[PDB]
Amino acid sequence: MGELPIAPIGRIIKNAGAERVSDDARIALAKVLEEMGEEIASEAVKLAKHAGRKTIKAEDIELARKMF
Amino acid sequence: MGELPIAPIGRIIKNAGAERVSDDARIALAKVLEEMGEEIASEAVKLAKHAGRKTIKAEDIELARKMF
Numbered sequence: 001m002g003e004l005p006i007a008p009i010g011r012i013i014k015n016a017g018a019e020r021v022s023d024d025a026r027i028a029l030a031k032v033l034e035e036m037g038e039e040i041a042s043e044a045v046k047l048a049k050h051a052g053r054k055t056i057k058a059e060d061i062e063l064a065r066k067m068f
Numbered sequence: 069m070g071e072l073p074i075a076p077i078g079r080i081i082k083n084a085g086a087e088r089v090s091d092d093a094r095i096a097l098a099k100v101l102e103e104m105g106e107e108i109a110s111e112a113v114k115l116a117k118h119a120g121r122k123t124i125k126a127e128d129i130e131l132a133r134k135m136f
């Protein structure tokens with residue numbers, strides 16, 4: 001948790017069509033995306049270990065995302 | 069799209085327990101999180117306009133996340 005920088009998150013909300021954005025909404029969306037990222041990456045670690053690898057690959061992320 | 073920097077995404081996957089991460093998995097998870105962020109923020113813009121505001125607030129992000 002707390003990995004994403006806040007300035008890029010406000011650009012996500014502006015690019016989605018917001019006129020103005022509070023810094024409290026940037027912190028809220030960063031928390032949602034870091035939680036979703038942790039859930040998908042923990043499934044991807046298990047998929048890589050099931051495949052016999054130590055490296056997480058794109059295919060592990062794509063398959064993990066389909067579990068959600 | 070393309071708002072999130074790639075280095076913080078690799079920290080999400082390492083913090084979730086990966087030993088090693090390919091730069092192709094960092095690009096893949098960034099794409100997933102930017103898509104989810106756009107969907108949640110577009111719903112939050114509609115909630116703010118329904119409330120009569122031009123500013124997106126934390127409560128708009130939290131309510132939008134419950135629609136997913």
Ligand SMILES: [Cl-]
Nearest residue numbers: 052053054055
């Ligand atoms: Cl490996």
Ligand SMILES: [Cl-]
Nearest residue numbers: 120121122123
């Ligand atoms: Cl306002």
